[PDB]
Each structure stands twice: as C-alpha cells, then as structure tokens.
Amino acid sequence: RVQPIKLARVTKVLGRTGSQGQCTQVRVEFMDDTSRSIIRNVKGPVREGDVLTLLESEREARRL
Amino acid sequence: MGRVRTKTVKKAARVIIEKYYTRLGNDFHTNKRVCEEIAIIPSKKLRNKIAGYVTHLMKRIQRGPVRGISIKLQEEERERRDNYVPEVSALDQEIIEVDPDTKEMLKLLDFGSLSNLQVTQPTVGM
Amino acid sequence: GGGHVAQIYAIRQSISKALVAYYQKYVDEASKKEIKDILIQYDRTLLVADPRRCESKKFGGPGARARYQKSYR
Amino acid sequence: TEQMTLRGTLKGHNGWVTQIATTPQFPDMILSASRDKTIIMWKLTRDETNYGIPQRALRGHSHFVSDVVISSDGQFALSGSWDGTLRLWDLTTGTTTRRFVGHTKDVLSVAFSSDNRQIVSGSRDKTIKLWNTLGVCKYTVQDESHSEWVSCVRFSPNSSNPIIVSCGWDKLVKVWNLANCKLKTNHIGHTGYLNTVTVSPDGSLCASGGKDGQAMLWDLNEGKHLYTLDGGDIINALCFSPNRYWLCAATGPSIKIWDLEGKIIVDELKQEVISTSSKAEPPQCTSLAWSADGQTLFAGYTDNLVRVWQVTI
Amino acid sequence: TPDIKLFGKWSTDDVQINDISLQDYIAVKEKYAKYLPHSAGRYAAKRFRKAQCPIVERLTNSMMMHGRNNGKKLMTVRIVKHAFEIIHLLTGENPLQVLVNAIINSGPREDSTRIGRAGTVRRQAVDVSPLRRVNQAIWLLCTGAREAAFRNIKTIAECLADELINAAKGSSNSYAIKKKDELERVAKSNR
Amino acid sequence: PVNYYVDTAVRHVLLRQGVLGIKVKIMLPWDPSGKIGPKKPLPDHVSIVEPKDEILPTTPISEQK
RNA sequence: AACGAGACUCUGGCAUGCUAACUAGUUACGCGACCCCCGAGCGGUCGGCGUCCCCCAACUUCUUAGAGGGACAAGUGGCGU
Known part of the structure; x- marks a missing residue:
C-alpha cells in the first residue's frame, strides 16, 4: 500500500501532553501547499516557525 | 510569578492614589521622590516597590478607570459625562403602535391616545 | 587572578575597552561607536563584563546543587 | 508668515533628552543632557543624514542628567544631576573642571550668569544654591524658600541688578535678589505644579508652566501678573525666541508655539510616523532650545532623539 | 582576521544547511563566524537559546564526556581543531560543511515514544522536532567517535573525522547512521 | 525586628520532682517610641501623609512686597 | 487586619562617580644605577622588560572599606476576564 515524505511548518504551539509532560502539541501549515493544516505530537523541544518531517501524513492525533 | 505584589504594597498604592492623584505621575522616578514627601516608609526597597506598583496603576488609570480606585478628579469627570440626553428618542414618531388589548387597556382606562392595531397569535410555553 | 582561560578573556576585554576608551577622549565619537559596533556585533563580551561567578556550596553535598548520597535503608 | 519644518534628527543618546543648550559663539555646536547619564556635544552639519554628528560624551555623572547649559562661547558646560552634584566640563574635550557638592537631593535645574561669574542650582532639597565657578557655595536660598520641590531656576537677563527666578511644585514662581540674597517677589496663581520657567530675552517677562497646561505670563518689572494661555496638556519646558515674540512649549501632545503680538497660535509641531496604527506614542518633548538665530529649534524627546525644526518663509 | 572572520582558519560564508527546517x-x-570553539557561553537559562550556540562549539562540548573528561574543553577544542584538519585533508571542502552535513543527515526524522498501551505497552510513532534532531545527532556522532576510539590506537580527532565524513555522505559505515536508521525503523512500525 | 524588638530569657527552675523551663518573651513597643528605635516602624509599616493643607480655585491676583 | 511566606537581614557581581589610604597598590617621574647590550648605532646616544634607589612627585584606575546609585519585570509589542 504506501510511501512519501512530508514537510510541515509549525503555526501554533498548543500546550503539553504525555503524563510525564514531554510531548508538545503542534499545529502545522503544510509547506508544499498552505491550504492544509493539522495537529501533530512532538518528541523534542519545538518553537513556532520550525519544521517537522511527517511520515504519516494523515492521522492527526490527540491525547495518549 | 515569581513577583506578585503583596497587600502591604498594593494597599499603599490604592492609598496614595486616593489622596494623591493630581500630585502623582506617569513616571516611576518622580513618585518615588513623592513617596518620601507624602508618606513615611521604613526601607528603601519597600518605598521603591510601592512607588513602582502605584505607577503601574497610574499608567492603567490614565487609560481607563480601574476597578476599585476613586479620586476627586475622576468623580468630577464621570459626573459631567453622566448628563447626556438628545432630541430624544422616545418620540415615538407620530402615533404609538399598540398590540391592542393594550388598545383595550386604554379603551377601558378612559384614555384618548394615538393608535395602531397588530396583535394576534398563540402562543407556546417553553 | 583567575586562572589560564580566565585570564585570556580578561586581557582581551581590557584591550578592546582600552582602544574604545582612547577614541572617546582623543579621537571622535563616530570612530569609537564604529568599534563598539564591530565588537558588540561579533562580540564575545569584549566591552561588557560577564556576570557569571561562583555559587556557594551548601552543607549536604560537596557542590552547590550536588546533594550527597542516600541509601535509605 | 512663515512656519517651521522638520529639518532632520540627531541620534545617539539612549536615555531621554532632558536638557538642551545652544551657543552663540559657535552656533554649530549643541550640548545635550540625557537620562543616560551622559551629555553629548554635537557639531551640526545641516549635513545630510544626522543634521549633525556627536562630538563628545560627558561621562561621570552617576545619575540622570537633568539639566545642562553652555557658555556663550561654547567653551564650558554646566550639568545638573540626580546624583546630587553639579559638573563643569570642558566642551572641547571632556574633563570636569569642578564638582559642585552640597545639595541634599537631585539637582533639577542649572543656569549660569552672562558674566560667567555666577552659577545657580535648583534641587529637590527645596533649596536654591548660588556657587562660584570654583565650586564654592555662596548662598542657599533657603527660607521656607520653597515649601516644595524646585523644578527649575533661571537667571534673568540684566539691568538693573541680579535677579533669579525659581519655579517649584509649591505652585508658585519666585523672584530672588542676589545682591541682598533675599526673596524679591512671590508670583502666585498657578494651580498645579510648575515644571519649567523661562525669562524673556531682555528680562522683563516671565513664562511659567507645568501640569494643568496653563502657561503663565507675568510682568517681572512692574511686579504685576499679565495673563494666562491654555496649552491644555502638561507642559515640560518653555522657551522665548531671541528675535521673535514667540514662546514655545513642549506639551505632552506636542510642541505648541505661539505668538504674543499679535496673539495667535503659530504652530503645533507633531512629528509623525508612517502607516503606523498607531497606539501609545509620545516621547513627548521634555526639552527645547532656541537657536542663536531663532531660525532653528531643537527639541529633546523621550524616544532619546533630538528633533530639529527650521523656520522657513 | 580583518578580511573575513574565518575559523581556526576556515570560512563560515558559503556553508549552507542543506536541509530545510534544520536550517537554524x-x-x-x-x-557568526568566530575564531574558536570556546566561549563564556550562557546557553542554559532559556529553553531555546542553545540554538544560538555555534554548532561547532556544540559539537565540541559533547566531546568532553565521561566523568573523567568533563570540563576538559581545552582538550575538546584541540580535538575539534585537529578533526577539521583531518576532514579537510580527506575531502577538501569545508570540514565545517562536512560537520554540518553529518548533523543534518543523522537526526532521526521519525521516532518512537513509549505510549502507555495497557498491558503490553506498545510504542507510538511520532515525528521529531528539529531541536531534538540536532541535539540527538551531535550525540550520536560523539558517542560514535568516542566508542570507536576507546580500545583502538586511533585518536578521537581521527575517529571523529571518520564518523563525520562517513555521515556527511551517509556511508552507513558510521555508528551514528546505523543508530538513526534503527530509531527511525522503530518509529515506522508501532504506527 | 526580632533582634530589635523582643527580649527573651530561658530559666531552669529546679523542683523536687524535676526541672521546669520558664521562657519569657517581651515585645517592647518602641516601634512606637523605642524610640526612636532601630527602625521605629516594623519594616512592615507605611504611614501616609496626604496633603495636610490646601485650597482655592481663586482667580489670579498678585501680592507686592 | 495580624501571624508563617513575604517584606526583613546577610553575602556577592554594575558603578574611569563619592570620601579617603606609607601596616594596600598604581602612574609617572626624578631616575640614576645594576645595567644587558636585546635591536639600531663605531661609540657617546635612542627605543626596550625587570630589580633596586628611595624622594619635599603625583593618584585612587586596579586594591581596600565606608558611604552612593542601579532592577521597579522600568519602555515597547503579543496574549489573558
């Protein structure tokens, strides 16, 4: 069934989840086409304007 | 945050402002001098902390009346504002439009008046 | 004072501050500003002294933030 | 017949430019006092991007430099400061000649006599002091002299005898006699706090103003009170023109110039901003100095910038 | 020194982070060219600030690891200066460019987190921030060089050059490259 | 202010049964007039002087002398 | 309104500002000398790092310890009742 790689740019930093408090919510402007905009969960330290490299490019999480 | 002014400070600010408004100013540097004249404050850090919060207030007051502070000048300003009244709004324009029954309200009240009928339909609860 | 790296940073700061102090009394202001510009830009503190200094160790660890060791039971 | 346009702007201070002084000896020079604790001497090109460029910084004061003045020659500078002292500097160079110590508080205002043989100072100590160029304090016009703070003290241009004029919070303007060292006349009438005061060119008038916005005109000679002009906003500094009958006042909203005879409002100078929205604002002009040739007008503003206007027909 | 502010002697200009997002x-x-991989450096107070820190120095700091080696920056600076020289001999270029490339190539794009998952705790594929990508890369390479160097005759400067070069063009010879691929492979399953 | 304001004393009173500890603490109020004390007010203090005198919109006018 | 927290006190950094210092130093002489030639000069002589001379030299910059001021998140811009 599938493969591609997706560039996405941080629009707005949502807040923090993980019970440990170590995953940061993010909103992403879809880079190759701005007419897209989705919520992704992060491992590292993230700040507005820097870029994610999305594997899955649907999905769109929430808690956990 | 970590700097949340405590009552002993915040009180003094409300205090001075109430009895000092036309004396006080926009600027930290001067009120600080003023607190020496108009108050007896024991340490310099406190007096500074006071001057500073009361200035933050003066900065705010001078942009919109603030929730619990009153001074003679602000009272005078509200007083004058609280006069307004136009051509005046009712009129209501020739002829009141009634809902009838309210028409029957006057009709059986022995009272002449201007008129208009548009009062029908029932009429659900909720 | 200080030690080997400590010293290097101090001397370099003294020299640049020096040159600027000199243009301020003898040459003209625009030159000295030009110099503060180049330093301050690329910098390294050249004209401003870094604050950072020892924090005192507190009983219960041999460092300042380091706390000894515990085993419980 | 004629109005004033914004020729250019001088940089370089960081604090607010509290005081300005011109020179006739070298009309090309400008001394300026600032919060930054430094005084800056500038050579004016007219040139082409900053109206001029800074020649010198006068260190040394630890605290807000409140007021400054220059000699006619442009040789020496007198600065007043919160630091509680007064400094005589060499314009040319730097090097404080002397330190004037003795005031208990911030020295608000400084002025020097035409002779260059008196120095007077006003301070938050509510006292006015007379000092020699040496640094010796001859007089302290003491005396309940101000119930209050002393915003400014100016030396009247001459003759019959030395007269000094002070302005204080106490809501009064005071005339003093130097020869005797006793209070000459109490001018009463202000009803807020007096920020600044200025004597006219020839020493027959007095203009004083502060927070209400009422610039006040007094006849010093007759010892009678002339009239009042409503500025509205708070006025920080006043200045008569050397050649014209124009008084200029730095208000909170801007610089208002007006003309005594005939009486009209010549101009309101507001410098602009472009496309800005714009919100907040005013670093209102805290200081102003007239040029030697009444042609130019320098103003010290809160943005730490000196803004210059030149009169054109 | 006055013409252009080179590195020990290497030019900052003309090195381009060949990888959008990482940029920066x-x-x-x-x-920000300087001269030496050593600075007073206050990076710690803020969360971000570290990014400001020159990557070279960042790499040098990671070098001084293991209890004994802590605080030996002079030693690291010395090692770094040598490594750049070895890298240069090996491919011309800017070794600094070589360094940057290795860093760009090593940060795990995707990773995995240990999501609670009930019992048999499963792991959730998540994408990884660029700060983490940089941070992680520099570790990987340093741990790589340090690990290799330890029982072998070869010096850290050399092992570092080898780790950096192989990574610059991802040879997969490198410990770090193999590690990154491992972390990423894991990220993909789980999902 | 503890140093300034309060005097304390501990006394051991031996009694047939055992010993009792008497602790006395006196707080001396020269914050009021103490006096004239090492601070007077308890750093936790702040007296306002408001005006204290003043009046008159009163038009202009001027007095000779 | 008070108590604890805090404010409070102590210590330590920013002060070519303050008042000062031979039981603290520095500049800079007067400095010669020791005096080496280190380079230049054939050498007298010039520039040169220190020690020592100590002086009816000057200073407070480093040092010192006292008093002074600085921070109030002060200005500005987003966000939030």
Whole structure:
C-alpha cells in the first residue's frame, strides 16, 4: 500500500501532553501547499516557525 | 510569578492614589521622590516597590478607570459625562403602535391616545 | 587572578575597552561607536563584563546543587 | 508668515533628552543632557543624514542628567544631576573642571550668569544654591524658600541688578535678589505644579508652566501678573525666541508655539510616523532650545532623539 | 582576521544547511563566524537559546564526556581543531560543511515514544522536532567517535573525522547512521 | 525586628520532682517610641501623609512686597 | 487586619562617580644605577622588560572599606476576564 515524505511548518504551539509532560502539541501549515493544516505530537523541544518531517501524513492525533 | 505584589504594597498604592492623584505621575522616578514627601516608609526597597506598583496603576488609570480606585478628579469627570440626553428618542414618531388589548387597556382606562392595531397569535410555553 | 582561560578573556576585554576608551577622549565619537559596533556585533563580551561567578556550596553535598548520597535503608 | 519644518534628527543618546543648550559663539555646536547619564556635544552639519554628528560624551555623572547649559562661547558646560552634584566640563574635550557638592537631593535645574561669574542650582532639597565657578557655595536660598520641590531656576537677563527666578511644585514662581540674597517677589496663581520657567530675552517677562497646561505670563518689572494661555496638556519646558515674540512649549501632545503680538497660535509641531496604527506614542518633548538665530529649534524627546525644526518663509 | 572572520582558519560564508527546517538550530554564522570553539557561553537559562550556540562549539562540548573528561574543553577544542584538519585533508571542502552535513543527515526524522498501551505497552510513532534532531545527532556522532576510539590506537580527532565524513555522505559505515536508521525503523512500525 | 524588638530569657527552675523551663518573651513597643528605635516602624509599616493643607480655585491676583 | 511566606537581614557581581589610604597598590617621574647590550648605532646616544634607589612627585584606575546609585519585570509589542 504506501510511501512519501512530508514537510510541515509549525503555526501554533498548543500546550503539553504525555503524563510525564514531554510531548508538545503542534499545529502545522503544510509547506508544499498552505491550504492544509493539522495537529501533530512532538518528541523534542519545538518553537513556532520550525519544521517537522511527517511520515504519516494523515492521522492527526490527540491525547495518549 | 515569581513577583506578585503583596497587600502591604498594593494597599499603599490604592492609598496614595486616593489622596494623591493630581500630585502623582506617569513616571516611576518622580513618585518615588513623592513617596518620601507624602508618606513615611521604613526601607528603601519597600518605598521603591510601592512607588513602582502605584505607577503601574497610574499608567492603567490614565487609560481607563480601574476597578476599585476613586479620586476627586475622576468623580468630577464621570459626573459631567453622566448628563447626556438628545432630541430624544422616545418620540415615538407620530402615533404609538399598540398590540391592542393594550388598545383595550386604554379603551377601558378612559384614555384618548394615538393608535395602531397588530396583535394576534398563540402562543407556546417553553 | 583567575586562572589560564580566565585570564585570556580578561586581557582581551581590557584591550578592546582600552582602544574604545582612547577614541572617546582623543579621537571622535563616530570612530569609537564604529568599534563598539564591530565588537558588540561579533562580540564575545569584549566591552561588557560577564556576570557569571561562583555559587556557594551548601552543607549536604560537596557542590552547590550536588546533594550527597542516600541509601535509605 | 512663515512656519517651521522638520529639518532632520540627531541620534545617539539612549536615555531621554532632558536638557538642551545652544551657543552663540559657535552656533554649530549643541550640548545635550540625557537620562543616560551622559551629555553629548554635537557639531551640526545641516549635513545630510544626522543634521549633525556627536562630538563628545560627558561621562561621570552617576545619575540622570537633568539639566545642562553652555557658555556663550561654547567653551564650558554646566550639568545638573540626580546624583546630587553639579559638573563643569570642558566642551572641547571632556574633563570636569569642578564638582559642585552640597545639595541634599537631585539637582533639577542649572543656569549660569552672562558674566560667567555666577552659577545657580535648583534641587529637590527645596533649596536654591548660588556657587562660584570654583565650586564654592555662596548662598542657599533657603527660607521656607520653597515649601516644595524646585523644578527649575533661571537667571534673568540684566539691568538693573541680579535677579533669579525659581519655579517649584509649591505652585508658585519666585523672584530672588542676589545682591541682598533675599526673596524679591512671590508670583502666585498657578494651580498645579510648575515644571519649567523661562525669562524673556531682555528680562522683563516671565513664562511659567507645568501640569494643568496653563502657561503663565507675568510682568517681572512692574511686579504685576499679565495673563494666562491654555496649552491644555502638561507642559515640560518653555522657551522665548531671541528675535521673535514667540514662546514655545513642549506639551505632552506636542510642541505648541505661539505668538504674543499679535496673539495667535503659530504652530503645533507633531512629528509623525508612517502607516503606523498607531497606539501609545509620545516621547513627548521634555526639552527645547532656541537657536542663536531663532531660525532653528531643537527639541529633546523621550524616544532619546533630538528633533530639529527650521523656520522657513 | 580583518578580511573575513574565518575559523581556526576556515570560512563560515558559503556553508549552507542543506536541509530545510534544520536550517537554524544549526548555527553557522548568518553571521557568526568566530575564531574558536570556546566561549563564556550562557546557553542554559532559556529553553531555546542553545540554538544560538555555534554548532561547532556544540559539537565540541559533547566531546568532553565521561566523568573523567568533563570540563576538559581545552582538550575538546584541540580535538575539534585537529578533526577539521583531518576532514579537510580527506575531502577538501569545508570540514565545517562536512560537520554540518553529518548533523543534518543523522537526526532521526521519525521516532518512537513509549505510549502507555495497557498491558503490553506498545510504542507510538511520532515525528521529531528539529531541536531534538540536532541535539540527538551531535550525540550520536560523539558517542560514535568516542566508542570507536576507546580500545583502538586511533585518536578521537581521527575517529571523529571518520564518523563525520562517513555521515556527511551517509556511508552507513558510521555508528551514528546505523543508530538513526534503527530509531527511525522503530518509529515506522508501532504506527 | 526580632533582634530589635523582643527580649527573651530561658530559666531552669529546679523542683523536687524535676526541672521546669520558664521562657519569657517581651515585645517592647518602641516601634512606637523605642524610640526612636532601630527602625521605629516594623519594616512592615507605611504611614501616609496626604496633603495636610490646601485650597482655592481663586482667580489670579498678585501680592507686592 | 495580624501571624508563617513575604517584606526583613546577610553575602556577592554594575558603578574611569563619592570620601579617603606609607601596616594596600598604581602612574609617572626624578631616575640614576645594576645595567644587558636585546635591536639600531663605531661609540657617546635612542627605543626596550625587570630589580633596586628611595624622594619635599603625583593618584585612587586596579586594591581596600565606608558611604552612593542601579532592577521597579522600568519602555515597547503579543496574549489573558
């Protein structure tokens, strides 16, 4: 069934989840086409304007 | 945050402002001098902390009346504002439009008046 | 004072501050500003002294933030 | 017949430019006092991007430099400061000649006599002091002299005898006699706090103003009170023109110039901003100095910038 | 020194982070060229600030690891200066460019987190921030060089050059490259 | 202010049964007039002087002398 | 309104500002000398790092310890009742 790689740019930093408090919510402007905009969960330290490299490019999480 | 002014400070600010408004100013540097004249404050850090919060207030007051502070000048300003009244709004324009029954309200009240009928339909609860 | 790296940073700061102090009394202001510009830009503190200094160790660890060791039971 | 346009702007201070002084000896020079604790001497090109460029910084004061003045020659500078002292500097160079110590508080205002043989100072100590160029304090016009703070003290241009004029919070303007060292006349009438005061060119008038916005005109000679002009906003500094009958006042909203005879409002100078929205604002002009040739007008503003206007027909 | 502010002797200009997004926590010097990988450096107070720190120095710091080696920056600076020289001999170029490349190539794009998952705790594929990508890369390479160097005759400067070069063009010879692929492979399953 | 304001004393009173500890603490109020004390007010203090005198919109006018 | 927290006190950094210092130093002489030639000069002589001379030299910059001021998140811009 599938493969591609997706560039996405941080629009707005949502807040923090993980019970440990170590995953940061993010909103992403879809880079190759701005007419897209989705919520992704992060491992590292993230700040507005820097870029994610999305594997899955649907999905769109929430808690956990 | 970590700097949340405590009552002993915040009180003094409300205090001075109430009895000092036309004396006080926009600027930290001067009120600080003023607190020496108009108050007896024991340490310099406190007096500074006071001057500073009361200035933050003066900065705010001078942009919109603030929730619990009153001074003679602000009272005078509200007083004058609280006069307004136009051509005046009712009129209501020739002829009141009634809902009838309210028409029957006057009709059986022995009272002449201007008129208009548009009062029908029932009429659900909720 | 200080030690080997400590010293290097101090001397370099003294020299640049020096040159600027000199243009301020003898040459003209625009030159000295030009110099503060180049330093301050690329910098390294050249004209401003870094604050950072020892924090005192507190009983219960041999460092300042380091706390000894515990085993419980 | 004629109005004033914004020729250019001088940089370089960081604090607010509290005081300005011109020179006739070298009309090309400008001394300026600032919060930054430094005084800056500038050579004016007219040139082409900053109206001029800074020649010198006068260190040394630890605290807000409140007021400054220059000699006619442009040789020496007198600065007043919160630091509680007064400094005589060499314009040319730097090097404080002397330190004037003795005031208990911030020295608000400084002025020097035409002779260059008196120095007077006003301070938050509510006292006015007379000092020699040496640094010796001859007089302290003491005396309940101000119930209050002393915003400014100016030396009247001459003759019959030395007269000094002070302005204080106490809501009064005071005339003093130097020869005797006793209070000459109490001018009463202000009803807020007096920020600044200025004597006219020839020493027959007095203009004083502060927070209400009422610039006040007094006849010093007759010892009678002339009239009042409503500025509205708070006025920080006043200045008569050397050649014209124009008084200029730095208000909170801007610089208002007006003309005594005939009486009209010549101009309101507001410098602009472009496309800005714009919100907040005013670093209102805290200081102003007239040029030697009444042609130019320098103003010290809160943005730490000196803004210059030149009169054109 | 006055013409252009080179590195020990290497030019900052003309080195380009060949990788969008990463651009910018890799700090060369979109103006910042200096001279030496040592600074007073206050990076710690803020969360971000570290990004400001020159990547070279960042790499040098990671070098001084293991209890004994802590605080030996002079030693690291010395090692770094040597490594750049070895790298240069090996491919011309800017070794600094070589360094940057290895860093760009090593940060795990995707990773995994240990999501609680009930019992048999499963792991959730998540994408990884660029700060983490940089941070992680520099570790990987340093741990790689340090691990290799330890029982072998070869010096850290050399092992570092080898780790950096192989990574610059991802040879997969490198410990770090193999590690990154491992972390990423894991990220993909789980999902 | 503890140093300034309060005097304390501990006394051991031996009694047939055992010993009792008497602790006395006196707080001396020269914050009021103490006096004239090492601070007077308890750093936790702040007296306002408001005006204290003043009046008159009163038009202009001027007095000779 | 008070108590604890805090404010409070102590210590330590920013002060070519303050008042000062031979039981603290520095500049800079007067400095010669020791005096080496280190380079230049054939050498007298010039520039040169220190020690020592100590002086009816000057200073407070480093040092010192006292008093002074600085921070109030002060200005500005987003966000939030």
